[PDB]
DNA sequence: CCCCCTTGAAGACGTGGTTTACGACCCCACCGCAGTGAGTGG
């Protein structure tokens, strides 16, 4: 069920960890900081833990 | 929690844990029969 | 102080001019409760204003005539907020600091506008009157 | 407008929190009623002119505040928020959520 | 005895809480 | 509640201030009046034949 | 000069409400009226001995030119000409 | 009675500007609007009266309600006073329609002070007038002071306080935890839509094991909405005891959960 | 350990008689910018 894997994550068992580094293979993330006077100001990287 | 329902002076507490205990009157309520009948099976009464 | 605005308002006449009220004199009582406690108990840190009033009677019945008697009381006022002993107000348990201002004074400033009419090329004199409690004055000159 | 667009919620300390378009609309609505009243009882013209202006006064408040005159205020000495105010400016529905 | 009366009729002073109010109770954490 | 509108049945008709106050205004052009003669028409200062 | 009896005390007179009404509102409500810094002795000084040109009666911060912002031989003393905030508020908040 | 009216404050000009009529012309026209119904007459007496509601309602700019509104409302008062004067009686209309203006007004008030109607009930009428003079001092009345003003106005302990409580009341306008919608968490709803779902397919399995007889009691009683059948429809039904469906069902709930538990 | 009773009563659901209680109605003698408008004088 959806909650045994939100108790599951709550607690953070170390397979939590393991299942989260293969989640954030190859997805990347947006960074911006504030102005965004060009569009340089977002950039796209690869997540490192 | 103490006898008066309020934690003891010097616990350590984190995330979750109660510090003071309250009840409030709920009323009527509406359940699915199914549900009600797991309810029934189990055996727990219905609390006010 | 207080004494200003007792004197500012007092004494008050009514529209028929059959009665009026006279201040007296005022005092500070002592405060119910301690800095601690009102820190404790939340709530605000005053002492209560006691005022003595005295009321006049005018007699109609005689064209200058105001004896007909006289009545003399002490009225409570409400609650003044007292100040520590470092400067602070104790207001609902929590401690308030108030910010001093700088302003312009009363008085008259003349001044010489700039920038305006800067096609004609001139400079417009002004000057204004600003009172402490009221309406302002000016006076301006235009370009003829 | 549709009452949840102006929300009315209560609060604990016996306090409300309230949309000034309520307010407004129950200005327009109780100078209509009182209008209404007017003309059934066969009153003097005069009374019902006055009325007549307090009501468009109400509803030029409503449809926008501060146009005409002073600005109808509330509690806070603030202007009442109107209809226009709500999709103009730099805290309008355009720039603030579209 | 007549200051320790007045000081334990100053301390055992009832509040005063609004209407509709029973008790209230606060709570301080450390960290 | 979040979509359905009602209405109020006014006893005497009103001006829309949008039509009447944003310059140029709208109904004194259509009318060919000026705007201080209608504002003083419409709010019970004079008459009009 | 509504009234009729002439057996009226002066507490007949005054009703108190709203005096204790407008110095409440002053000492909770004034946007000269706010919470002491207490991070340190040094905040608590500053904050007291803080000097502001806003408020009621005073300048605004939308409409605040350059000059008034500007240091004046004339504060030479007076107030400090290196303490200030580096925000909007910049020229609009001194110190003693 | 064709003076322009641009704003209150003209108004207030030609209320004023209407000459003030004597007792003795007075009752000319209050004696043909009773017997003979003279509309005229009952005109001339409202507009001769217009700047006696005007400064009535000058008493009441302590509610911060416009004082345009309030001047109508008493304008509607004094018609009614007028429609029901009777001149015989030799005092005159001021005196009579004092009550009548007064009235409208308070009842404005009540309706209009708050976005929400403070005093509705009888009790609560009389403590809206009241609470104002007998208040001194800030704050809330402690235990004694409560019964004293309950004692004199005919009123219950629990009126005082409730009303003492809508008198302080200041309503926050809209713009803190009251902005948030409280059924708007869809991520709860669905957890909680697939934990009742993966119960139920249990019962169901459960109530597979359970024999032909013992499902249909089970069915009956409990899972039917249209009806609930009781101990004895069934008893017919299958021919057995008013006792022994109840008897049934306690050993077969016993199977049913141990199905479940397992 | 299936079956039909018993036999005593606990609660179960109205229920509109009976009875308060709410709500309402009646009387009361800065910042520079640009478009607008009269307003001339001609």
Redesign the interface.
């Known amino acids: 069920t959806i909650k045994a894997a939100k108790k599951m994550v709550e607690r953070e068992e170390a397979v939590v960890w393991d299942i989260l580094d293969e989640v954030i293979r190859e997805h990347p993330v947006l960074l911006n900081r504030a102005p965004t006077l060009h569009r340089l100001g977002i950039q796209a990287f690869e997540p490192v833990l | 929690l103490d006898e008066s329902g309020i934690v003891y002076i010097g616990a350590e507490v984190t995330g979750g844990d109660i510090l003071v205990g309250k009840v409030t009157p709920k009323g009527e309520t509406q359940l699915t029969p199914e549900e009600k009948l797991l309810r029934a099976i189990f055996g727990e009464k219905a609390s006010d | 102080g207080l004494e200003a605005a007792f004197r500012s308002v007092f004494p008050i006449q009514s529209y028929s001019g059959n009665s009026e009220l006279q201040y007296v004199s005022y005092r500070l009582g002592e405060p119910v409760f301690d800095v601690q406690e009102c820190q404790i108990r939340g709530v605000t840190y005053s002492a209560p204003l006691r005022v003595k009033l005295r009321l006049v009677i005018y007699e109609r019945e005689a064209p200058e005539g105001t004896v007909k008697d006289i009545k003399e009381q002490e009225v409570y006022m409400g609650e003044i907020p007292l100040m520590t002993d470092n400067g602070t107000f104790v207001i609902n348990g929590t401690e308030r600091v108030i910010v001093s201002q700088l302003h312009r004074s009363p008085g008259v400033f003349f001044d010489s506008d700039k920038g305006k009419t800067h096609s004609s090329g001139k400079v417009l004199y002004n000057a204004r009157i600003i009172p402490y409690r009221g309406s302002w004055l000016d006076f301006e000159f235009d370009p003829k | 407008l549709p009452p949840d667009l102006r929300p009315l919620v209560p609060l604990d300390g016996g306090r409300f929190a309230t949309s000034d378009l309520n307010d407004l609309y129950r200005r327009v609505i109780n100078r209509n009623n009182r209008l209404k009243r007017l003309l059934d009882l066969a009153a003097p013209d005069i009374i019902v002119r006055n009325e007549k202006r307090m009501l468009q006064e109400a509803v030029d408040a409503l449809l926008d505040n501060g146009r005409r005159g002073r600005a109808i205020t509330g509690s806070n000495k603030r202007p009442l928020k109107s209809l226009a105010d709500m999709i103009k400016g730099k805290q309008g529905r355009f720039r603030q959520n579209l | 005895e007549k200051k320790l009366e007045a000081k334990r009729r100053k301390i055992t002073q009832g509040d005063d809480l609004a209407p509709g109010v029973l008790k209230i109770v606060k709570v301080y954490l450390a960290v | 509640r979040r979509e359905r509108m009602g209405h109020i049945e006014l006893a005497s008709p009103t001006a829309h201030i949008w039509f009447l106050k944003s310059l140029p205004s709208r109904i004194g052009l259509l009318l060919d009046m000026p705007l201080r003669d209608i504002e003083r028409v419409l709010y019970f200062e004079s008459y009009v034949v | ?1 509504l009234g009729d009896l ?1 057996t ?4 007949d ?5 709203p ?3 407008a ?2 509102e002053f ?2 409500s ?1 946007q ?7 991070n340190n002795p040094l905040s ?1 000084i500053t ?2 001995r ?6 009621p ?2 300048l605004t911060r939308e409409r605040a030119g350059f000059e008034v912002r500007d240091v004046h031989p004339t504060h030479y003393g007076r107030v400090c000409p290196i303490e200030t905030p580096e925000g909007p508020n910049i020229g609009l908040i ?1 110190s003693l | 009675a064709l003076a322009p009216v641009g704003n209150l404050d003209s108004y207030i000009r030609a209320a004023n500007a209407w000459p003030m009529l004597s007792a003795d012309e007075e009752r000319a026209l209050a004696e043909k609007l009773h017997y003979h119904g003279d509309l005229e007459a009952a005109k001339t007496l409202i507009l001769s009266h217009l700047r006696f509601v005007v400064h009535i309602a000058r008493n009441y700019a302590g509610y911060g309600l416009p004082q345009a509104d309030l001047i109508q409302e008493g304008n509607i008062g004094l018609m009614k006073a007028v429609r029901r004067f009777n001149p015989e009686v030799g005092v005159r209309l001021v005196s009579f329609a004092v009550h009548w203006i007064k009235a409208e007004i308070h009842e404005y008030v009540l309706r209009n002070w708050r976005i929400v109607k403070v005093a509705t009930t009888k009790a609560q009428r009389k403590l809206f007038f009241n609470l104002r003079k007998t208040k001194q001092r800030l704050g809330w009345f402690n235990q004694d002071e409560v019964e004293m003003v309950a004692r004199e106005l005919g009123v219950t302990s629990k009126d005082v306080r409730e009303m003492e409580s809508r008198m302080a009341a200041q309503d926050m306008t809209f713009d803190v935890l009251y902005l948030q919608d409280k059924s708007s968490n869809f991520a709860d709803g669905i957890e909680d839509d697939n934990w009742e779902e993966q119960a139920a397919n249990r019962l169901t399995d459960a109530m597979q094991g359970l024999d032909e007889r013992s499902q249909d009691i089970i069915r009956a009683r409990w899972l039917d909405e249209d009806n609930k059948s009781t101990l004895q429809e069934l008893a017919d039904r299958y021919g057995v005891s008013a006792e022994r469906v109840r008897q049934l069902e306690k050993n077969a709930m016993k199977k049913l959960r141990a199905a479940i538990e397992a």
């Open positions: 000069s002439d009226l005390m002066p507490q007179m005054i009703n108190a409400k005096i204790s009404a110095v409440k000492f909770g004034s000269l009226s706010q919470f002491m810094d207490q608590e904050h007291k803080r000097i502001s040109a806003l408020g009666g005073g001194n």
